[PDB]
C-alpha cells in the first residue's frame, strides 16, 4: 500500500588528478556530516518540502547516520516524483538562505563567503550537495543521493635541487626564510554552482615579487604525526638541510583562469653570487583554468 519514503545518501570520493584520474575517499574529517538539509521539489522545480536535520529525530522523520539514511514520514502518494536535493554541513547563513528558497533555480544563488578562502579557514566540516530525481511511487527508497563537496583541494610537493638546499632558520617550526602566497582565490562557496560561476577574488598577500614582506612563512603542521589534512611542511636531511616542501590547501571552485600559488625560495651562495643579486627566487604555480569542486589536484615538482 502507501508507505513512507526513505533517502539513502553517500559522500562522493574526491577525484584526484595529476600528470590522471583516481578516486580517493579522503579522511574522516573530509567525510564528516554534522547536519543535513533536504529539499524535495516537485517535477516543475517548485513547491519544495524541506527538512532541516541536526540529530536522529526531527519533525517529520528520522536520521540514521550509521546507515546514511533519512526516513521521512511523507507517503509515496504525497511524494510522487521529486527533484531531491540534499545539502550537508550548512551553517546558519546557508540554512537561512535555504529556508528562503522557492524554486530549484534559486539553489545556485545560495553561497557562503570566506574572507580568507583557503586552509585553515576552509576546514571540516565541508559544505556538500547532491541531487537525484526520483519517483517515490515506483520505489519508496531513493538509493542514493551522492553528496559532492563544494570545495576543491590542492597538494603541491616540491623536491628541492641543491641550489635551494639551505640550512634554514626555523622559528617555532616555521621556515622563516621561505614564504608563499595565494593569488586570485575565490571567496564564495556556492551550494550549487551556477553554469558560469562569477568571480569574487582575493589574494593572501598584496606584495608583488620581489616585495615578499607580507607573504606567509612556510610552516611545519604537515610534519607531525598524525598529520592534519591541510597545512605546510618540509623535510630536513641528517645535516639539517631542507630537501623538500609540501603545501596542502582547500580552495573554492573557479570557472575562470588565473588562480596561482607563489613561493619565495632562498638559495645557497657558493661564494660567487654578486651582492647586488642576493635574495630569494620566485616560483609560480598556475592552478587549473577551471578548478572543479571535489577535485584534489596533486603536483609533484622539482625546483
Do residue 91 and residue 140 come from a single domain?
yes
Answer yes or no: do 39 and 176 share one domain: no
Q: What would the grid cell of residue 289 be?
A: 583554468
Examine the domain organization and report whether 56 and 162 are in the same domain: no
- Residue ending a domain, among 105, 133, 149, is 149
Q: Which of 300, 298, 178, 152 is nearest to 234 (CA)?
A: 178
Q: Are residues 185 and 134 in the same domain?
A: no
Number of residues assigned to the chain:
303
Structure's resolution in angstroms:
1.5
Q: Is 283 in the same domain as 166? A: yes
Do 140 and 162 belong to one domain?
Answer: no
269 and 187 assigned to the same domain: yes
81 and 126 housed in the same domain: yes
Return d(Cα 167, Cα 112) in angstroms, integer.
42
* 252 closest CA partner among 106, 130, 121, 157: 121
- Three-class DSSP labels, the chain: CCCEEEEEEEECCEEEECCCCEEECCCHHHHCCCCEEEEEECCCCCCCEEEEECCCEECCEEEEHHHCEEEEEEEHHHHCEEEEEEEECCCHHHHHHHHHCCCHHHHHHCEEECCCCCCCCCCCCCCEEEEEEEECCCCCEEEEEEEEECEEEEEEEEECCHHHCCCCCEECCEEEEEEEEEECEECEEECCCCCCCCCCEECCCCCCCCCCCCCEEECCHHHCCCCCCCEEEEEECCCCCEEEEEEEEEEECECCCCCEEEEEECCCCCCCCCHHHCCCEEEEEECCCCECCCEEEEEEEEC
Residue finishing a domain among 149, 171, 194: 149
For 75-93, b/e burial (b = at least 16 CB within 10 A) is bbeebeebbbbbbbbbeee
CA distance 48 to 58: 18
Residues 105 and 27 in one domain: yes
Query: Rounded to an integer, what distance in angstroms lies between the CA atom of residue 69 and that of residue 142?
Result: 10
Query: Which of 99, 127, 149 corresponds to the end of one domain?
Result: 149
Residues 135 and 234 in one domain: no
CA nearest neighbour of 36 among 134, 149, 127: 127
Q: In this structure, are 95 and 177 located in the same domain?
A: no
Say yes or no: 160 and 303 in one domain.
yes
CATH of residue 57's domain is: 2.60.40.2580
Task: Supply the range of the domain harboring residue 247.
Answer: 150-303
- Within 10 A of 32 (CB to CB), how many other CB atoms are there? 13
Sign of CA dihedral 96, 128, 258, 157: positive
φ, ψ (nearest 5 deg) of residue 107: -65, -35
Q: How far apart are CA 160 and CA 163, in angstroms?
A: 8
- Count how many domains the chain has: 2
CB of 218 within 8 A of CB of 245? Answer: yes
| Closest listed residue to residue 254, CA positions, set 190, 302, 160 | 190
Amino acid at each position: 500500500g502507501d508507505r513512507s519514503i526513505e533517502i539513502s545518501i553517500r559522500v562522493d570520493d574526491f577525484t584526484k588528478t595529476g600528470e590522471r584520474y583516481e578516486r580517493n575517499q579522503g579522511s574522516a574529517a573530509e567525510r564528516l556530516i554534522t547536519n543535513l538539509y533536504l529539499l524535495l521539489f516537485d517535477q516543475s522545480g517548485a513547491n519544495p518540502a524541506k527538512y532541516y536535520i541536526t540529530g536522529n529525530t526531527f519533525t517529520g522523520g528520522t536520521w540514521l547516520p550509521d546507515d546514511m539514511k533519512v526516513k521521512l514520514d511523507m507517503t509515496q502518494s504525497e511524494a510522487g516524483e521529486r527533484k531531491v536535493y540534499v545539502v550537508a554541513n550548512v551553517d546558519n547563513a546557508v540554512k537561512t538562505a535555504l529556508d528562503a528558497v522557492a524554486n530549484e533555480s534559486d539553489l545556485q544563488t545560495v553561497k557562503r563567503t570566506t574572507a580568507m578562502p583557503w586552509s585553515t579557514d576552509i576546514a571540516s566540516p565541508f559544505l556538500m550537495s547532491g541531487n537525484k530525481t526520483h519517483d517515490f511511487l515506483a520505489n519508496r527508497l531513493l538509493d542514493n543521493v551522492p553528496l559532492v563537496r563544494a570545495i576543491a583541494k590542492v597538494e603541491l610537493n616540491i623536491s628541492l635541487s641543491e641550489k635551494f638546499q639551505i640550512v634554514p632558520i626555523i622559528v617555532n617550526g616555521s621556515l622563516s626564510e621561505f614564504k608563499f602566497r595565494y593569488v586570485n582565490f575565490d571567496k564564495e562557496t556556492y551550494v550549487v554552482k551556477p553554469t558560469t560561476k562569477p568571480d569574487n577574488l582575493i589574494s593572501s598577500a598584496n606584495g608583488v615579487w620581489p616585495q615578499i614582506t607580507d607573504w606567509t612563512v612556510w610552516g611545519a603542521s604537515l610534519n607531525t604525526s598524525p598529520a592534519p589534512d591541510a597545512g605546510t611542511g618540509y623535510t630536513l636531511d641528517a645535516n639539517g638541510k631542507v630537501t623538500a616542501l609540501r603545501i596542502v590547501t582547500y580552495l573554492n571552485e573557479r570557472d575562470s583562469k588565473g588562480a596561482t600559488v607563489e613561493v619565495a625560495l632562498p638559495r645557497v651562495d657558493d661564494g660567487t653570487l654578486p651582492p647586488p643579486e642576493f635574495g630569494p627566487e620566485l616560483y609560480r604555480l598556475p592552478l587549473p583554468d577551471k578548478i572543479l569542486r571535489n577535485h584534489w589536484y596533486k603536483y609533484e615538482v622539482e625546483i
